[PDB]
Amino acid sequence: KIFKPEELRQALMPTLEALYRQDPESLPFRQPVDPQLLGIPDYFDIVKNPMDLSTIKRKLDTGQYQEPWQYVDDVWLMFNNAWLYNRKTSRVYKFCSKLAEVFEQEIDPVMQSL
Numbered sequence: 001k002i003f004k005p006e007e008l009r010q011a012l013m014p015t016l017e018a019l020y021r022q023d024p025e026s027l028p029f030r031q032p033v034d035p036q037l038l039g040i041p042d043y044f045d046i047v048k049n050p051m052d053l054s055t056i057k058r059k060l061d062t063g064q065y066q067e068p069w070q071y072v073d074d075v076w077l078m079f080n081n082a083w084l085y086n087r088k089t090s091r092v093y094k095f096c097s098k099l100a101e102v103f104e105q106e107i108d109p110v111m112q113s114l
C-alpha cells in the first residue's frame with residue numbers, strides 16, 4: 001500500500017492531538033527540549049536524537065512520513081528518550097508512561113482502519 005500525505009495526516013493527526021490534550025502529562029513533551037533553559041545541560045550527551053510533539057506535528061503537516069510506522073517510530077523515539085534520560089521517580093518519566101498508555105490505545109484502531 002502507498003499512503004498519500006493527506007491520508008496519513010487525516011488518520012494520524014487525531015492520535016497526536018490526543019497526546020497534546022493530556023494534562024498534566026503532555027506539557028514537557030509539547031516543544032523541543034532546550035537543555036539550557038531547563039537546567040539540564042547534559043541532555044544532548046545522553047539523548048542523541050531528540051524528538052517532541054511539535055516536531056512530529058510539523059513532519060505530519062509537511063509530508064515527511066511515507067508510512068504509518070515512521071510516525072509511530074517518532075512517537076516512540078520521544079518516549080524512549082524520556083525513559084532513558086529521566087529517573088523512574090521523576091515527573092517526566094511517569095508522564096511519559098502515561099502518554100505511552102494513551103498512544104497505544106489511540107493508535108490501534110487507527111492502524112486497523114489503515
Ligand SMILES: C[C@@H]1CC(=O)Nc2ccc(O[C@H](C)c3ccccc3)cc2N1
Pocket residue numbers: 027028029033038040081082085086091092
Ligand atoms: C522531555 C523534556 C526533557 C526531559 O527528558 N526531561 C525534562 C527534565 C526537566 C524538565 O523540566 C520541566 C520544567 C518540566 C515541565 C513539566 C513537567 C516536568 C518537568 C523537562 C523535561 N522534559
